[model samples]
Target: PIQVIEDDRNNRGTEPFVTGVRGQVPPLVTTNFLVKDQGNASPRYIRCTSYNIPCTSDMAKQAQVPLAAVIKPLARLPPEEASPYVVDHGESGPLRCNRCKAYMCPFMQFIEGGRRFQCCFCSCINDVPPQYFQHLDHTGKRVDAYDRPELSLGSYEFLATVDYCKNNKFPSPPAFIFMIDVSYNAIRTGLVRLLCEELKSLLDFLPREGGAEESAIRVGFVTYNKVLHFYNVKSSLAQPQMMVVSDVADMFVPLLDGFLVNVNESRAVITSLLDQIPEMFADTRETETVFVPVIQAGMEALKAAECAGKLFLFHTSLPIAEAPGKLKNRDDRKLINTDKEKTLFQPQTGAYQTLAKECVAQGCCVDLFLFPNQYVDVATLSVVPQLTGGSVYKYASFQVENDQERFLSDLRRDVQKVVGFDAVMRVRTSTGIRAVDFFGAFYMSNTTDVELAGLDGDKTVTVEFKHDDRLNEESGALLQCALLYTSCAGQRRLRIHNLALNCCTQLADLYRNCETDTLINYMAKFAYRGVLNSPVKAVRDTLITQCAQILACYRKNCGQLILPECMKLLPVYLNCVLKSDVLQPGAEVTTDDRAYVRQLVTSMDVTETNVFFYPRLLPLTKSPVESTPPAVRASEERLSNGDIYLLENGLNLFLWVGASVQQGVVQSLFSVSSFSQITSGLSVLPVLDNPLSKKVRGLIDSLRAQRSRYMKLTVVKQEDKMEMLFKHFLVEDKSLSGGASYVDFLCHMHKEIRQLLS
Candidate 1:
């Protein structure tokens, strides 16, 4: 365990040991506290480029580390962690800074004998409310500092008043609209049946907030083909009725009252309708499936109901039906390497964009679950979901038997996850600095407000900040984001994440204390946004410049081909970004793949984003061994002749059954023979009764837990179609796209660094 012969920065086999400044305040030096980010407020929710911010713009420029906050404020706590305390500050809402309007956090000062308080964000003085004020002790601290979560805790929530609510109207329970594609293609793939069955089973699990007067949730369904079919499952009636609307030219809801009915009230009707759907549309061969009209109908439904909701559209193939949002034959992969390849990455039609902005205006989020046999022009349709704070799920070449478990699990997981509606998140910084660019799955109706039609735990937003005035070097820096959203229970909420940073004059502290994961997440989002206008090569070059610039600065100014120890994985990650499916240049890369990844990366939390480009490999052995085997690097060189490895890439799981493995181990995993008879390719793990199988199952469950999407298990043996993918997960290995190995990649960067210094 203590072999210390040579040092390699890139091969640490884990994330860097994040060192935060401690000893000042007890648990105050947490993950985002420096950036509790785990340190109870953990860096998983909020991370900064530098825990120690530079005093001046020139200071940061010299170091070249971005001064920004990559935050996922509504990130889900792992099942084990405690949920944040929700503070209802009566009608006054949460306390705020008078001048800058930032929320009160641990850093605020109790000045003027606690009659007035000084805002740490802007240093502005404000008279404290008489009821809330407490005399400060000798240490300039509140008498009840630890007693209040708002004063010391990094994460907390507040119940908002009607004044803070949209339109000054009281919030109503949110609605979930399921738009199903009953077109023959969807029916043939068994998507419709599977979707309805999943919804029927999850009727009890649909997201709800417990309230006295208001119903917790409202549900609606629309099954469409050449025409629209709206189900009226109002509890008033004994049975449900299917109202068909063929007016594709103009869309409108026939009735508003029963269209989105209470789940508890209409459970019987809803269940009956779900059971009847498969056979009802079993013989229909209608080919036309109008996509835009359905969104129009969904938006219209939400408008008529006078509420905010999430639209779950289960779709099949492209909208080949008719006008409104017609996109036909717009894809051409031959242009992938050409200058015109930018078109493939951009929106095909302006229609989708216009309608999407309208949806955002009406507080409607559109999520697409696509089961397609052909390219459905994802880049075009994705605009609606991406901007509205929703996402797209693609199941290409769908077959019921092979893909049921994956799709079913995704449906249930998505339906049950925590969600918020009509969210507006705003990040406030200390004086002299301002948020310049906001990037993620959200809309900015204006500069200060980020409009998220809907926000779930999986979504994140990145903000790029700049210097407008000189910061106070004597004090510290503050960043707090105020998220005001309507909860599922029909109540207004204000969620705030507070961040504190010290001002540093030296660049070494900035470099040594920098974050590689956050910097990588920020650059990945930048690359995603940058590629829409520039060529892939330009995006690739930008990444190259970033790696070279940081390394070059350290070499010429401060000083490998030596780097800042915190940045050992910088070049390796950048290379992974270069060779990623989204950024890689080739005709083999599909249009849907590019659009889906772009939408996903923009919203992914730090861990999901990291695991995507750089996957994890685990060794599964039958010996009397440690409960957790060390995670090996994702390289072919790391694999032994008889080792069984499980590779997780966030999208799929691979069980590499190596040749010459023990027969009993094979028996435990697959319940079958040795390597010769082992099942290979896309399949689920048959957990036979055994301890090794149990260990493998538990490890698989742990990795898939809280993941961005369902990772379907795939068994891999030597020289299979899946073998190539297992090789691709070997991120350090050279690829057909001309990507260099980790060694050569770093060496190339080293050579470039030498030239830059000369």
Candidate 2:
């Protein structure tokens, strides 16, 4: 649909001239290629030239080598004639033979750079395909749905397909070949002692004991200086086939433990078994996992496993400057690089990266432990440990201690704390119900928050889904799983009881300073505690929810009541507040209300309440209440004349005694409450001035005694003013009815006299 704008000339406006030439609709661009019909193309071998450049219209007569001639090694052939090694096609237009079915030849579509083609018999080329040229869908329909954009290849999908075609599979478990360095170096400087001690500590530090005789730990050793000498630390022991920590520890003595297979014996056994290293170290059959320590002869002993587990290297050797007999030259010697101010022992950055790539590709983790006062190649150690998810322990800050006891203790704690048991769980199913069995080590503090929140808040934990193995699992696989969350709470606990048990039991023999039985018992208790407490404690709220659900189910099914038990457990959990008297009220009773007290005592029920009241039988109100007596008036008159006749003497005594005595009586009530039994649910009064309050009563008696000594000392009798003085200030030595000292009264009088003088 076009509208024409008139031109200024309008010359015959219709020479049929085309307008809007620049804005005219463009023709669609199309890609074209030679496509053979399905039946037309030969299914048999065809030599094609995979030209990297487009064929020119004029010079298409050029001769070129077909991919079949270039990459014939990768062509499918009989197993007898095919090469076992992998062949890679370099980047370029690759010519390939149609030796097998088109579908079987996956490289047909990738006929671009990074490919080559060759003849099966005599390497030769026939024709080459141009670069970026699309191959036709020769099936006369759209390509298979797998090639569609929506269903196109992703990394995982591509890998899976490649894996399937190549028959690539995960190895069951890596063979663990331990090449423990028991060289002279390891034996000297008390490393043997430290090793033995740490080994013992390791046993104690393990999360759990696995077995009595044959543990999950299997060990082999290689000691060397000039040439490596290998020994089966596992075979020299009583149980050759079955090795445990007990066996390892029993072999360890003050300086040297057993595993001392003679050099000749080691040579004979090691060489004899060299060919069977693959079978000996494979994780298949009896072995499920392996741990190897990188030492001098480690590579030779453990290189058999095509794919292996982690390698833990405990080395003391610094990087060598040169081969023992080699000349010290750039090509012959490995220079100690300290360019980064890092340790000389550290592997060069490039070396570390290469090592990591190799180890990770083979499914092996690398852990390194450098001795104290030793330099560690931070770069190499970091990359290997980092890439493989292993650990590196540098003794940079740790001092070498000479004290065996302290050293053993600290070493034991550290190794045990770090190495043994991570959380692992197992679920047992019966009758369609699942009971999770946790068998690892855990910390009490780790699960405390969960326990608290479950008890105090409405949060609940639930098992939403079971875990899938991050790594493949075998019979004795150590698996770690997560507890998924449905609520806001994000805390979780890991279980590693099974692994812990094995480690703990294995390291038990190394403990000598601590009693074997006692340590074992203590270790066993905590180890089991970790297993039982961790998972249950971590999901306490979940357990509560489970309990609630159980109760509801029980009630629905059998009409059972659970409220009583719930109520009983409530107090136990909330805390019994009535256990101590320091938390109770003290000023609950007053003897001033005698009538009220009598009524309370008469109405008290002694059966239910654990309370009892004792009355103060002695009368406290026998004396009359005084109103401005003549003694006060006389004392005032005497004081006015500068006589200072100890005016208001009783006032001073009242102020002092009242404050002190009242406080003591109040405190005494708390003591009585603590000691006395409450009965009949009644609040009972405590005995005031009774046997318990004797000290308080004595003070009152002293005050009364002081007053009695101040007899009517009258100077004159007047209407408005009278004079009073001490008639006879004599100290009575006789014992009074109340337990009061005559000296106490005299002391009061002496103070009054001194005040009058001042």
Among these predictions, the greatest lDDT belongs to: 1
Q: Each model's TM-score? A: 0.92, 0.25
lDDT string for model 2 (1-758, tens) is: 00011111122232322211211111100111122111111101111111111112111112111111000101122223211111121232122233421111211223235354432112232234544123323324465544421012100000011222113342222223333333333444444445533442243223122132322222244332223334443234432221222122112112112232322333334333332333333332221111121321233233343323334454443333222211111221122111321122223435444545455444344445544333333333344554343444444323344234333433443332212111112221111112122111111123211111011010111111111221111111111111111111111121110000000111111111111111111222222223212432232223223224322332333211232221222111111111111111113211112111121121111110101110001112212233211122111112222111221222111111111123333345324231122121111223454443453345344433332111111122111211111211101221221211233433443343344335
Q: Assess each prediction's global lDDT (C-alpha) against the native.
A: 0.77, 0.24
Q: Candidate 2: lDDT of 602?
A: 19
- Stretches off by above 4 angstroms in model 1 are 1-41, 133-146, 210-215, 585-588, 622-628
Q: For model 1, what is the alpha-carbon lDDT of residue 248?
A: 88
Q: Could you give candidate 1's per-residue lDDT for residues 500-577 as a string of tens digits?
A: 767777777677677777788888989988878888878878888887888888775572268787677778888888
Q: Give Cα distance to truth, residue 234, candidate 1, Å.
A: 1.1
Poorly placed runs, candidate 2 (over 4 Å): 1-170, 173-186, 197-217, 224-227, 234-303, 321-349, 374-376, 397-758
User: Which candidate has the highest TM-score of all?
Assistant: 1
